[PDB]
Structure formats: C-alpha cells, structure tokens
Amino acid sequence: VECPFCDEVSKYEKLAKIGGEVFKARHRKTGQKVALKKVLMENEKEGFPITALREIKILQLLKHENVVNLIEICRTKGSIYLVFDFCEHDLAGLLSNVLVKFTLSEIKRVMQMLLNGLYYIHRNKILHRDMKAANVLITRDGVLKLADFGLARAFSLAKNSQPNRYTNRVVTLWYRPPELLLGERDYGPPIDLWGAGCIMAEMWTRSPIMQGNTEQHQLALISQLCGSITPEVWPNVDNYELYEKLELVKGQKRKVKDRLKAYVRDPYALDLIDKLLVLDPAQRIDSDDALNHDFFWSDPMPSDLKGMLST
Amino acid sequence: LFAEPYKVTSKEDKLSSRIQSMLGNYDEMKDFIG
Amino acid sequence: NNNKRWYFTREQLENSPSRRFGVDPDKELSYRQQAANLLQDMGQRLNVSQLTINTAIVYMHRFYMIQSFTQFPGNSVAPAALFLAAKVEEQPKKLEHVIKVAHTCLHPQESLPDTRSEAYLQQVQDLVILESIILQTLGFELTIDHPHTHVVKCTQLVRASKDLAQTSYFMATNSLHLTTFSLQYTPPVVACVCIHLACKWSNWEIPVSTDGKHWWEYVDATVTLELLDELTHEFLQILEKTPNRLKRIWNWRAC
Amino acid sequence: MEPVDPRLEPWKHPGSQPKTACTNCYCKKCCFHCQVCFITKALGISYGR
RNA sequence: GAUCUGAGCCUGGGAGCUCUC
Ligand SMILES: [Zn+2]
Ligand SMILES: [Zn+2]
C-alpha cells in the first residue's frame, strides 16, 4: 500500500496532553517541538469531517507572522494528525496566572498583533468564527499566533444579490456576537472582531466579561453592558425573526466604559473596546481602522513581550 | 484594451482544417454547446 | 518544489504507475477518459457545479499518477473523488445520495440496495476508506486551479462573442476528459490552447492589443505561438484517436 | 458547456445538470446537448456496467 | 452461454451484427 506523501506519526515523540486531542511531541531526529492535533472522526456518518478539510485547506493558504503555521499531516499504521509549530504560552493561560504582569505598552502590542492577524485572514476571505483567549497563542519570543481554525471558513463579498446562508451556531457563547444570537446567517468579519473586543477586555479583567449559560442569557448580559438592542442603534434589527420572539430588556443603557472603567483605566483603551463591542455589526469598527486607533499611536508605544514572559 | 474578435477569410491554417475535418462545421454546432 | 510536484513530463507519463503493471499507454488514457465521463455523468445527476466535476477530474488524474488502475478501479475511485470534490467546492452531497446515483450509473439493471441491507453498509465503508486514501495520495492538496477560470477572463477581455466564449470554455472541459494537460501544463497555458483551438475551428481571429501584444501574452508570460500550435497538435491528435462518429454527425437528420 | 464566472464562490456556481433532459438522439444537435452526450455520442466513450 | 473464457463494430443508444469455439 503506497503512501509516500504521508509520513507516520511515529516520527514524533509524544510528551504531554493538551487541549486525547492535542499533544506536545518532538521530532525524534531533529528534536523540533510541535503540536499534534488528532482529527476527531467520531462522526463517521459523512466520512472525513468537512470541518477538518476546511481547516487544512485554509492553513495551507494562510501564512502570516501572526498566524499558526501548519507543518504537515501524519497518520497511523487510520486516524489523522495535524502538525503545528508548538507554542509555549497561550493568552488564556497567561491571563489566568497572577504572577504575570502586563504593562500598558505590552498590552497594546498583544492587540496590535491580534488585529494584524485578523486583517490577514479577513483579507484572504476567511472567517475564524471562534475568537477567544484560548485560541490566542504566544510563541517563546513573544509573538502572538492565531490558532484553531476548525470552525473557520471562507466567506463571500455578496455580489450585491442574494445574501449568503452560513452556519448560525458558531463561535463560543461567551465570545458570540449579537447578530449570531438573533439568527443572522449572512454575517462576515465583524463577528471575529467582537471576540477581539471581548479578549482585549480580559487583558485587564483577566476573565470573560460576559459569561452566559445560555443563548438568551448571553443576550441579556450583552444588553446590560452594551445596552438595549433597539432599531435606533441597530437599524433593521427588527427584521430578525428572533427580535420579538426573544424577550430583550429595553431599559438597559450602554455602560461598556462605565463597567470596564475601574479595570482598563486608560482612556484610549476604553474607547477602542467601546467601538469593538458595538451591537450593530455595520457600525462595528474593522480591524484596519482598529490599528489606526490612537490607542496604538499614543504614549506609551507598543513593545515586545519578552520582558513579561520572564515571569 | 482588446478589439472584438472577427472571422478569418478562408482558414488556411493546417490546424484549423484538421479540426474542421474532425469535429465538423463550427457554426452548425454552436447553438448546442452550452 | 511543491509546484513541480503535480506536473510531469511526457516521459514520466509514459512510465505511469499503471505502466508498471503492464498497461498500454493508449489503454491507460482510455481509463482516464472513462473515469472523467463517469464523474461528469454522476455530477450532473447530483446537480453539482461544473467546478466540482472538474475538481474531481483533477484528483483522478493525479491519483493515478501515484496509484495504478490495476489496484484501484476507475469506477470505484470516481465515486469517492466526486464525493470529496463536492465538499471542497462548498457543495457537499449526502453520502447516501452519491452511492445511490453511482449505483444507477454502474448498475442500471440491479435495484438500488436497501439503506439497511448488509451490502449497502459495505459500499459506504469502501467509499469512505477510499476517500481517505485519495487525500493521502494527493498530500491533502485539495486546492486546484482550472483552465476555465483563465478562459473566461480572457474571452471577456478580448471582447469575444458568446458563441466563441462558449466554445473556448467547452474545449476547456474536453481537455480534462480527453487529455492530461492538467498534469503537464499549468491552467493558464491550457486555457490558451483551448481558446486557440476554438478560434481555428471557429475561424475567429483575436487581433493584437493596442499595445502591440498578443492575446495569450495577457494570460501567461510563458505562452508563445510556437507552443500553442504544438499543443493544439497534440490535442487534436488525441481527438482523432476517438472510437466514434465525428464525420457522420454532419447532417440535420430527424430524431 | 456553458462558461462560468470564476470570481463566483464554489457554493455560488450553478449546477451542471442541463436545463433540458438529456434527449435520446444521435443527431448533430443532441451530440452537443451536454458534456456527457458529447463524450458518449460524439466521441463514444462509455464506462459501461 | 459467458461476456473481470474476451470483443470488433455500428443503424435511432443495439431491439443490429460477425470474429478465435
Ligand atoms: Zn435528436
Ligand atoms: Zn445530455
């Protein structure tokens, strides 16, 4: 049984468990550190999961200094394994550790690389649809890397005609944007930034600002923070078949900056977060304009993270 | 940038005639292709 | 050197995996044409975009560049190939639908096996397993570029008429069904061959750009008149080797 | 048989199935009805059962 | 009669036909 274009996973040596899905192995010969991601073929109802095909098809395309690199794909003497360039830390883990200290300068660098990464994937017509501190890796040299593109795919620029009908149930409930919670299937890049805004808020809160247990509960929290969802602030929001069928508060006002006031502290920082957590995706600032925000061009200026990683 | 294509007065190209004697007369097999 | 991977020469093709198990050159190509025909037939019955079909055809040509018809039947790889291309081209078709249509084309006599029968459950595994094999054999390189993409862009630029545009695109499909240029020349080059081949047959001649440059120069910087004529020669040479009537159909007979 | 704008996304491309049911005639008109007819009728290439 | 003990080939795709037995 010929198979020259698919080396055996035996070439790697498993060390520990991550994410029995993701493992930390090292090349038996070179000694290079890598991340083994086993393909979950639990649902063999439709052969090889289309979700995997996309991730693989996308990773082979995307190649940025802020995006995880896909080395190769191994097998078993069978199951499939996706090899990536091992990442020492992860935004999620770092924020969880108290010993870790983030300076206003270092924080700006983290987001700068994050948004810079989104700009790439978005420019290449790709949607992550799963933004969270957990998927935000950071190399040993202090280089942010976007990983886990399982729920990621490619969207279209709607040729001014019949809209698209993508999957609705996407992105973590905690990092899921309003539109998705209203039944929006013709979404786009804005859904990713919403998570980025929630992630940038955790850089000071060290914990998810909106932890809902259900879809409706999530909306309630978003309405109490970002304010009540009304046609005024969200034009044509009433068109949603779930707008009226879902009891949403009407009195709650926008208190994004007010709630994150004692945390963020920094003026510019608060302003950016406010533009990223905008209810209406049409008015939601994009990655491009996000990088041009005074937040990234005001003293103190962004700097590497090596100093912080020393703890 | 380009000019709208035109017909060729008696295709003398050896390649052209080779196709004509293979697939047949063009004009007569167009309203069927697609 | 990932580019030159799925691009061989006339000699390499002359020594294909199948040629290693004793399979005449003209015989192998025959299997390829048949495999492409099956994919085209099943695709239309599944109502899938031409893109999905072409993509499936490409995998077929490349798949047999590492494997042999002696080990992998063309009527078996086709179903799996098409089933895979469907997903890649954002147009997946239920495994049940594929097997059903594939059985209608391969077994017009026998009746469609019950979705509960032991025989059916078997065909499922065989197709799924073969699918994984195709992926590994291709190195998981699903991304494929078709000449049709370059053919359409060129026709619109040269301001070619519909009849000419339809023919150009038409020949672009025949190349994947009869020839193996998809394993020899890049899509851009193949696109020029189709248009050039369509022009000679349509008597249409594409003028020279207002800048003094040929049309093919706007499709590929490595394409030359000498190449087109040579390639067009091989294309037709393969067309002449067809086992059916292409001279008797020159009439307006009834139905 | 009919050209398709590449700029269009995979999930946007139209089906390959011909508008009219693949007729059953060897006439010079049906030989080009579709891709299959051309390969099976004009070229006479079949996969058989 | 097979028809992975085969096919050549062709009229409206066989409902046509002959080949080494
Ligand atoms: Zn007819
Ligand atoms: Zn037809």
Author numbering:
A (entry chain A): 8 to 26, 31 to 88, 97 to 330
B (entry chain C): 34 to 67
C (entry chain B): 7 to 261
D (entry chain D): 1 to 49
What did the paper state?
Transcription of the HIV-1 proviral DNA is initiated by RNA polymerase II (Pol II) binding to the HIV promoter, but stalls after a 30–50 nucleotide transcript containing the trans-activation response region (TAR) is formed. Release of the stalled Pol II is dependent on the recruitment of the host super elongation complex (SEC) to the nascent TAR by HIV-1 trans-activator protein (Tat), a central driver of proviral transcriptional activation. The SEC is assembled on the AFF1 or AFF4 scaffold protein that interacts through small binding domains with the positive elongation factor b (P-TEFb), composed of CDK9 and Cyclin T1 (CycT1), the transcription factor ELL1/ELL2, and ENL/AF9. P-TEFb facilitates promoter escape by phosphorylating two negative elongation factors (DSIF and NELF) as well as the C-terminal domain of Pol II.
To clearly define the interactions between TAR and Tat:P-TEFb, and to determine if direct interactions existed between TAR and AFF4, we solved the crystal structure of the TAR:Tat:SEC complex at 5.9 Å resolution. The structure of TAR bound to Tat:AFF4:P-TEFb reveals extensive interactions between the TAR loop and a composite protein interaction site, composed of CycT1 TRM and the Tat Zn2+-coordination loop, Tat residues 24–29. TAR loop nucleotides G32 and G33 abut the Tat Zn2+ -coordination loop (24-29) and CycT TRM, residues 259-261. The backbone phosphates of nucleotides 30–32 contact basic residues in the CycT TRM region. The structure of the TAR complex with Tat:AFF4:P-TEFb shows no direct contacts between AFF4 and TAR. Instead, AFF4 helix α2 and its N-terminal loop connection to helix α1 are interacting with CycT1 TRM and Tat helix α1. The interaction network between these three protein regions most likely stabilizes the protein interaction surface for TAR and indirectly increases Tat:SEC affinity for TAR in the presence of AFF4. However, there is not interpretable electron density present for residues in the Tat ARM region at the limited resolution of this crystal structure. From there, the ARM (residues 49-57) extends into the major groove of TAR stretching from the TAR bulge towards the phosphate backbone opposite the bulge.
